[PDB]
């Protein structure tokens, strides 16, 4: 089973450096070329670097030849890539990708991808998030409201996981220089407020984890 | 540099329907020496990384089912989905890998599903006690499982129509039911909202000649 798994996405002010890394197995990663390909905020699939099977022959666009760097080490199944110069323009979620093609050969392309990093760059600051419980003043719709954080992302869970197919999460806005996002849950009128709703949520990036019991009003 | 162009940018299909996208090609990617056209085609369904779908423009990979098409050669290419399932909701990319030429892909076709029409949900919630305490007060609606997406929010304050503070968010299509949901925020200071006492959020969708109508007194 082919698994990609990418880790060093992270916030990084405008000028700075960072190294991303791929933990390849399933295959014979000495076999194939890897390659990094991001996906920008409007949703663009863009390549930034691959390397040969061996770690020999090196390619890049023009948008990160000098300020990039692929590499790999074929005895810990690794891929890397070293940015630095990093611009607010290279803010995207990365991919490892995996050439399709046995070693040199060509007609095959790139067929297995990672998971992703997330990878920021900016020059605001980290601030863990407000967390505020949204209930109402058969079915009982609950919220929570997640303001003033950054960066991306939080992650809101209801009754930690437990609740629910019935869960909205609405994507983040940025609203001066700082992020809110909401969450919503409908449970049944039978279960609030008898039964305890509570909203986790974690922000990795200021180490946060904030969990908000639902309370009723009057 | 080969410029990938995908027409149109989205579109709205209904389950067991064909589907046809469209990828145009800067310049040939038919190989001669080859006799290839070095043209891939990959979906990426939300939240997930792309998956390859198509290679060499008409070869299926592996586990993708028979229901996916590719055809044309050197700039002009389609995929073809011939019964349109809920799951193939995705976005699908096509990509050149010509040898001599740096990697390049289109900007995406975003396949959504066509469902019935249905009403949105509104619910409205006053400022939490710890968001007054620190000085701020955020009215919000949530305008549930509606379809299509386009529906408008107005915010009324003791009867006038308020246009400052407001931010609205829409949801991606539902994997379950096909629908969008919105959350709207109005957003004022403790000072401003203690001024005001009726605090309404009316919903207008395609569904109804009568919008929704949620509010609260601050008492």
């Known amino acids: 089973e082919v698994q990609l798994v990418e880790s060093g996405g992270d916030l990084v002010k405008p000028g700075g450096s960072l190294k991303l890394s791929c933990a390849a197995s399933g295959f014979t990663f000495s076999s194939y070329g890897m390659s990094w390909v991001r996906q920008t905020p409007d949703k663009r699939l863009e390549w930034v670097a691959t390397?040969?099977?061996?770690?020999?022959?090196?390619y890049y666009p023009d948008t990160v030849k000098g300020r990039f760097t692929i590499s790999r080490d074929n005895a810990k199944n690794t891929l890397y890539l070293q940015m630095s110069s990093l611009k607010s323009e290279d803010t995207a979620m990365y991919y490892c990708?995996?050439?399709?093609?046995?070693?040199?050969?060509?007609?095959?392309?790139?067929?297995?991808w990672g998971q992703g990093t997330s990878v920021t760059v900016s020059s605001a600051k980290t601030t863990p998030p407000s967390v505020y419980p949204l209930a109402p003043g058969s079915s009982v719709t609950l919220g929570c409201l997640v303001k003033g954080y950054f960066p991306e992302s939080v992650t809101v869970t209801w009754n930690s996981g437990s609740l629910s197919s019935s869960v909205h999460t609405f994507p983040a806005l940025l609203q001066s220089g700082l992020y809110t996002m909401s969450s919503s849950v409908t449970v049944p009128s039978s279960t609030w407020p008898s039964q305890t709703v509570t909203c986790s949520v974690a922000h990795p990036a200021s180490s946060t984890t904030v969990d908000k019991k639902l309370e009723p009003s009057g | 540099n080969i410029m990938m162009t995908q027409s149109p940018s989205s579109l709205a299909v209904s389950a067991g329907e064909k589907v046809t996208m469209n990828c145009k090609s800067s310049?040939?990617?038919?190989?001669?020496?080859?006799?290839?056209?070095?043209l891939a085609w990959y979906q990426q369904k939300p939240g997930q990384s792309p998956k390859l779908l198509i290679y060499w423009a008409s070869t299926r990979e592996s586990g993708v089912p028979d229901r996916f098409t590719g055809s044309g050669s050197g700039t002009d290419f389609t995929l073809t989905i011939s019964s349109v399932q809920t799951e193939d909701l995705a976005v699908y990319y096509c990509?050149?890998?010509?040898?001599?030429?740096?990697?390049?892909f289109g900007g995406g076709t975003k396949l959504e599903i066509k469902r019935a029409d249905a009403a949105p949900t509104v619910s409205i919630f006053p400022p939490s006690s710890e968001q007054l305490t620190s000085g701020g007060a955020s009215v919000v609606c949530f305008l549930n499982n509606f379809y299509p997406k386009d529906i408008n929010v107005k915010w009324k304050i003791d009867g006038s129509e308020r246009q400052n503070g407001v931010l609205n968010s829409w949801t991606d299509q539902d994997s379950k039911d096909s629908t969008y949901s919105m959350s709207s925020t109005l957003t004022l200071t403790k000072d401003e909202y203690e001024r005001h006492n009726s605090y309404t959020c009316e919903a207008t969708h395609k569904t109804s000649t009568s919008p929704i109508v949620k509010s609260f007194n601050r008492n």
């Open positions: 990708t995996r050439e399709g093609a046995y070693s040199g050969s060509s007609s095959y392309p790139m067929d297995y």
């Open positions: 390397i040969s099977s061996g770690g020999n022959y090196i």
């Open positions: 990509h050149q890998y010509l040898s001599s030429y740096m990697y390049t």
């Open positions: 310049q040939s990617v038919l190989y001669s020496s080859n006799q290839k056209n070095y």
